[PDB]
Amino acid sequence: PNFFIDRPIFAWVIAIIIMLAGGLAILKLPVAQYPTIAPPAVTISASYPGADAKTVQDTVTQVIEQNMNGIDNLMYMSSNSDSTGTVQITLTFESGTDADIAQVQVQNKLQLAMPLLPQEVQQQGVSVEKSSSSFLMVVGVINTDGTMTQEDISDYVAANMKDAISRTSGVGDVQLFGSQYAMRIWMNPNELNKFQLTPVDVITAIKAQNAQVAAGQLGGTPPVKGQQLNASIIAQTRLTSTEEFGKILLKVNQDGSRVLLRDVAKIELGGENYDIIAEFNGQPASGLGIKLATGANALDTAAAIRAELAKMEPFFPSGLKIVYPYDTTPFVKISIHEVVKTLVEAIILVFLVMYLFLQNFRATLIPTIAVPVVLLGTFAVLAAFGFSINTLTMFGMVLAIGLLVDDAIVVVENVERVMAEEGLPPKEATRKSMGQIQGALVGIAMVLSAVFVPMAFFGGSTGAIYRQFSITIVSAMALSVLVALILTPALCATMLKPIAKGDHGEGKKGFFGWFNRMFEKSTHHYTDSVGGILRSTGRYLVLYLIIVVGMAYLFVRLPSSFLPDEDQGVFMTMVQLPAGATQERTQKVLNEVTHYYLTKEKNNVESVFAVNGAGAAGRGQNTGIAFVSLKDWADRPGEENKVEAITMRATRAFSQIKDAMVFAFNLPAIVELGTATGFDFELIDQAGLGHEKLTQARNQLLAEAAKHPDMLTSVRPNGLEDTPQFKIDIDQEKAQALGVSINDINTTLGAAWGGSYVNDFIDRGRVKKVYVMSEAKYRMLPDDIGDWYVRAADGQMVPFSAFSSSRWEYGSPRLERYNGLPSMEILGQAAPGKSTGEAMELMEQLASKLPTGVGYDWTGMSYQERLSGNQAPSLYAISLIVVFLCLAALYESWSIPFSVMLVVPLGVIGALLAATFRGLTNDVYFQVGLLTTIGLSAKNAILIVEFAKDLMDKEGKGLIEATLDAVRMRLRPILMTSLAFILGVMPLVISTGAGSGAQNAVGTGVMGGMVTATVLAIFFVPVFFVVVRRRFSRKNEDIEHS
């Protein structure tokens, strides 16, 4: 401690070494958008090509709800048995548990359910995957000069992209937007009716005829003696073109004109799927969706992926140009520069105050030298802690500048002044300053560490967010304090100039501002003034009660948040066509949207990405999606050119002048969050009921909670509503007569109207699928039920109109689950001005009052936020209790910490007051701001009160006079610091451009908080201190202690 005062170079070594500890800790330090914030979930999906809702729920889903029993860290099971054949189970897990543990546990509990799958699934896999929706990227692929169409792009995408670009240094998961090539065989039921042939004979044709086969070997082992040759048998070989498949034989007629597949059906090298359509500005495109890598940098995934795409880009076909409709990278690149930028400004402004007060080049430089050693060395504190330098944490740094310089600054002042009051040599007066103010610095260390720690031990996403500042500003804190035991004190004695007793500077320079007198003159006004109030206490007690009270009322009338909203340079508008509509009407909507953006907002939009076929709730021709990217932030000025107004006028444009519900919107800051005032009610069927009853419950309840405009809000379903289905009940009697085979009827119905994955072939050197679906026009109109004939056992065909009754019933096309049992997703919300949980109480009261097998339970957003709920008061009571007891400790009593605790309201009342005026919100950034304010307030009170009690004690002076002296001499520093702060934090406060929701949010609460805190505390604290101490001890008295 004192010891390093007389080892200045040893100190230096610590300084240059730690600064380097910094630079080295910076160059290879990770950067992300935010820290990994969201609870990890793993999802299981399977593909049952052509099934209906009840089917993928009842063949794949339910036998699963029974065999993956027993994975640990159980939490909840949300599922969709899509009526497209996809079954999707998202297990969303408890925060921060290790994912991969879950992932393997599950993949090895499905292989328990595996033979208990249907065989078309069983052959087409089931996938278990750790999952988010956080696409780092969606990279488009297009051809400019209409050279290829969606399936060509898609095919190349699957054959020339996904193995070598995703070798680039920085990559996690890959997802292809489009369809891989598959050998597409389109059966004509006429040309199949002709030769009495049905799908089954076709199936059996391509299956038996198309493969590799068990060869054998000449000289096979074990051969027999004398042998002098060993060689391999080749055989029947899998096919290769569209050519080799038309030449395939199905049956030879007695006349000799053989019938090949080329005849009965049509042949094209086609797509494995024609569900979703991908349009880049209307032009054909197919796309890719990329997730970041396991601790990887976003910007280097960007440098290497974009370099890689540029490495195959001439080695791409003609017209084939890669596109970037969706990146979350420049937002982050620019986020970083804007935050450094503000910090740079903060540095310079702090230094400005620092000069225009200390005015001595070498003395004004010492605390400026103070800063790099401190940050750079803090980066070293981060590089070793396993976290990342993102916007938020480095924000903790820019925020930390105040609790950094504060210490060092105080010391340079205390020394300069003592050197004006005792005349001693640099080093000695310095020594006294360091030995008397040890308590100032170790005290601040004790309490700031005391206030930023309690937040790190908070839960949830917001809690981890807190973890980041805790560590940055505490490391920053402790190191600034500790530099204050090694660095700052030696820098204090040594690089600082010696002063004789009473130098004062008063108007002792003319061109450089006489200024100093004014300060000094003014502090006389200040000082006489504190005395004046000290004489008359009661008044100040009362007015305090005012500030307290105001602080309270005002706290209430300040509305919460979870995080601020962000113009990300990228937003999206989604489309929704009424039940059962087709792909066509949706596609009308997508290009019409594309018109709106490229026209009535032509200047703002750069590229639209139109997606037809799966949108929000699920997959389904009637559903659409649009990615709207903008021109770089430099060219979007006003209120009207930023995401806000754009979304407003977009959805404005579409709501009242269409037949379809189509909405435009802006994405959250955090790439997955609590939907704030609200929930996602899971309505669970527990009793032996069925889908009709839950839905009727949806009617009942959507009617039961929407009837309270005073508590509940947005009673809406998320999903697709109840669609028209076409039951074709086959009467088996009739076919058990006619000599037709059921397998023949079924598999023909299937392979005709759904289709069948039959075999595999080898296109261009890569294995792909072989599909035989009927053609368009022979299975698109109800009437086409007819054109299909079954070849009996005897030998003549039968119409479906010979055995098939045909009707329209009802079903929902997206079958939801919550833990293996029948469930329903009611998204919902509390009134904009009601807490969400109150809405939980009234909604639970309605959904309680529903039929037995219609229950209530919680999922997603309202789950974790229900268990980890009633705790925020407890931890901030702790941040406070740590403040009261820790400073009661560094000193040595009780009454003496109370007087410093009286300051927090002077601090709070300022964060509310300034923020309320702007329009900000008691969210996180205002919370971290709030804590920091507490810190500031107690700091300053530490300054003054410390000096007064010290004198009272160890030099025995009188209270009032000691408070006045302290108050007098400590005015100057308090002010130096505080000005450094307000001015350092300022730029954040008024800056627009990336995350300014963030900058502004930190800044405003922090600034106004600091102002009222000081400009009121420097008048209250001495009266806090005086009256506080005046109710403890008896004799003394007003102490003279010699």
Point out which residues bind ligand LMT (CB under 6 A): 529, 532-533, 535-536, 1019
Site for a second copy (CB under 8 A): which residue of 29, 31, 63, 1027?
63
Helix, strand, or coil (residue 897)? helix
Q: How far is the CB of 906 from ligand LMT (least distance, A)?
A: 11
Site for a second copy (CB under 8 A): which residue of 43, 57, 472, 991?
57
Q: How far is the CB of 790 from a second copy (least distance, A)?
A: 14
Instruction: Compose the 245-284 pattern: x for residues touching a second copy by CB under 8 A, - for all others.
Output: ----x--x-----x---------------xx---------
When asked if residue 762 is in the footprint of a second copy (CB under 8 A), the reply is yes
Helices marked H in 721-771: 732-738, 742-753
Q: In terms of CB distance, is 119 or 536 closer to ligand LMT?
A: 536
Site for a second copy (CB under 8 A): which residue of 40, 49, 984, 997?
49
When asked if residue 899 is in the footprint of a second copy (CB under 8 A), the reply is no
Q: In terms of CB distance, is 106 or 944 closer to a second copy?
A: 106
The Cα 948–Cα 941 span in angstroms is 11
Contact 643, 568 (CB under 8 A): yes
Q: Which of 944, 942, 873, 930 is nearest to 901 (CA)?
A: 942
- Considering only residues 114-133, where is the footprint of a second copy by CB under 8 A? 114-116, 119-120, 122-130
Q: In terms of CB distance, is 529 or 725 closer to ligand LMT?
A: 529
Q: In terms of CB distance, is 210 or 388 closer to a second copy?
A: 210
The Cα 391–Cα 468 span in angstroms is 10
| Residue 691 binds: one of ligand LMT, a second copy, none (C-beta under 5 to 8 A by kind) | a second copy
How is the beta sheet containing 41-47 ordered, strand by strand? Answer: 126-131, 41-47, 86-92, 76-82, 814-818
Q: In terms of CB distance, is 186 or 515 closer to a second copy?
A: 186
When asked if residue 685 is in the footprint of a second copy (CB under 8 A), the reply is yes
The radius of gyration computed from the CA coordinates of the chain, to the nearest angstrom, equals 37
Q: How far is the CB of 960 from ligand LMT (least distance, A)?
A: 11
Q: In terms of CB distance, is 38 or 299 closer to a second copy?
A: 38
Q: In terms of CB distance, is 225 or 557 closer to a second copy?
A: 225
Q: Which of 630, 629, 642 is nearest to 140 (CA)?
A: 629
The Cα 406–Cα 640 span in angstroms is 41
| Residue 819 binds: one of a second copy, ligand LMT, none (C-beta under 5 to 8 A by kind) | a second copy
Q: In terms of CB distance, is 515 or 544 closer to ligand LMT?
A: 544
Query: Tokens for 890?
Result: 């560094």
CA angle 356, 358, 360 (to 5 degrees): 105
Q: Is 14 exposed, middle or buried (0-12, 13-18, 19+ CB in 10 A)?
A: buried
Phi, psi values for residue 418, rounded to 5°: -60, -35
When asked if residue 779 is in the footprint of a second copy (CB under 8 A), the reply is yes
Q: How far is the CB of 697 from a second copy (least distance, A)?
A: 14
| Residue 106 binds: one of ligand LMT, a second copy, none (C-beta under 5 to 8 A by kind) | a second copy
Q: In terms of CB distance, is 531 or 754 closer to ligand LMT?
A: 531
Helix, strand, or coil (residue 707)? coil
Site for a second copy (CB under 8 A): which residue of 315, 361, 511, 553?
315
Which H or E element spans position 242?
A: none
The Cα 319–Cα 156 span in angstroms is 13
Please spell the DSSP secondary structure of 799-857, one letter per residue. BGGGTEEEEEEEE-SEEEEESSSBEEEEEEEE-TTS-HHHHHHHHHHHTTSS-TT---B
Contact 293, 301 (CB under 8 A): yes
Q: How far is the CB of 529 from ligand LMT (least distance, A)?
A: 4
Q: In terms of CB distance, is 535 or 602 closer to ligand LMT?
A: 535
- Considering only residues 973-1032, where is the footprint of a second copy by CB under 8 A? none
The residues with which 16 forms a beta bridge, in sequence order, are none
Q: How far is the CB of 535 from ligand LMT (least distance, A)?
A: 3
When asked if residue 718 is in the footprint of a second copy (CB under 8 A), the reply is no
Site for a second copy (CB under 8 A): which residue of 780, 832, 1036, 1038?
780
| Residue 224 binds: one of a second copy, ligand LMT, none (C-beta under 5 to 8 A by kind) | a second copy
The Cα 988–Cα 1001 span in angstroms is 8
Q: In terms of CB distance, is 760 or 961 closer to a second copy?
A: 760
Number of residues that bind a second copy (CB under 8 A): 237
- Considering only residues 154-213, where is the footprint of a second copy by CB under 8 A? 159-160, 162-164, 166-174, 180-190, 198-200, 202-203, 206-213
Site for a second copy (CB under 8 A): which residue of 225, 557, 1034, 1035?
225
Q: How far is the CB of 616 from ligand LMT (least distance, A)?
A: 53
When asked if residue 938 is in the footprint of a second copy (CB under 8 A), the reply is no
Site for a second copy (CB under 8 A): which residue of 3, 23, 66, 635?
66
Q: How far is the CB of 687 from a second copy (least distance, A)?
A: 7
| Residue 463 binds: one of a second copy, ligand LMT, none (C-beta under 5 to 8 A by kind) | none
Which H or E element spans position 92?
A: strand 86-92
Site for a second copy (CB under 8 A): which residue of 80, 286, 335, 922?
80
| Residue 714 binds: one of a second copy, ligand LMT, none (C-beta under 5 to 8 A by kind) | none
Which H or E element spans position 741?
A: none
Contact 723, 861 (CB under 8 A): no
The Cα 140–Cα 285 span in angstroms is 7
When asked if residue 811 is in the footprint of a second copy (CB under 8 A), the reply is yes
Q: How far is the CB of 518 from ligand LMT (least distance, A)?
A: 18
Site for a second copy (CB under 8 A): which residue of 582, 655, 699, 871?
582
When asked if residue 737 is in the footprint of a second copy (CB under 8 A), the reply is yes
When asked if residue 443 is in the footprint of a second copy (CB under 8 A), the reply is no
The Cα 569–Cα 630 span in angstroms is 6
The Cα 305–Cα 327 span in angstroms is 12
Q: In terms of CB distance, is 817 or 939 closer to a second copy?
A: 817
Using the 8-state DSSP alphabet, how is residue 151 labeled?
Answer: H
The Cα 699–Cα 702 span in angstroms is 5
When asked if residue 51 is in the footprint of a second copy (CB under 8 A), the reply is yes
| Residue 460 binds: one of a second copy, ligand LMT, none (C-beta under 5 to 8 A by kind) | none
Q: In terms of CB distance, is 294 or 656 closer to a second copy?
A: 294
When asked if residue 972 is in the footprint of a second copy (CB under 8 A), the reply is no
Which H or E element spans position 320?
A: strand 320-327
Burial track 875-907 (b if 16+ CB lie within 10 A, e otherwise) = bbebbbebbbebbbebbeeebbbbbbbbbbbbb
Site for a second copy (CB under 8 A): which residue of 34, 76, 357, 789?
76
CA angle 1026, 1031, 1032 (to 5 degrees): 105
Q: How far is the CB of 1032 from a second copy (least distance, A)?
A: 46
CB count, 10 Å around CB of 1030? 12
Burial track 503-526 (b if 16+ CB lie within 10 A, e otherwise) = eebeeeeeeeeeebeebeeebeeb
| Residue 1019 binds: one of ligand LMT, a second copy, none (C-beta under 5 to 8 A by kind) | ligand LMT
Which H or E element spans position 694?
A: helix 691-705
Q: Distance from CA of residue 926 to its chain's centroid?
A: 19
| Residue 926 binds: one of ligand LMT, a second copy, none (C-beta under 5 to 8 A by kind) | none
The Cα 409–Cα 407 span in angstroms is 5
| Residue 894 binds: one of ligand LMT, a second copy, none (C-beta under 5 to 8 A by kind) | a second copy
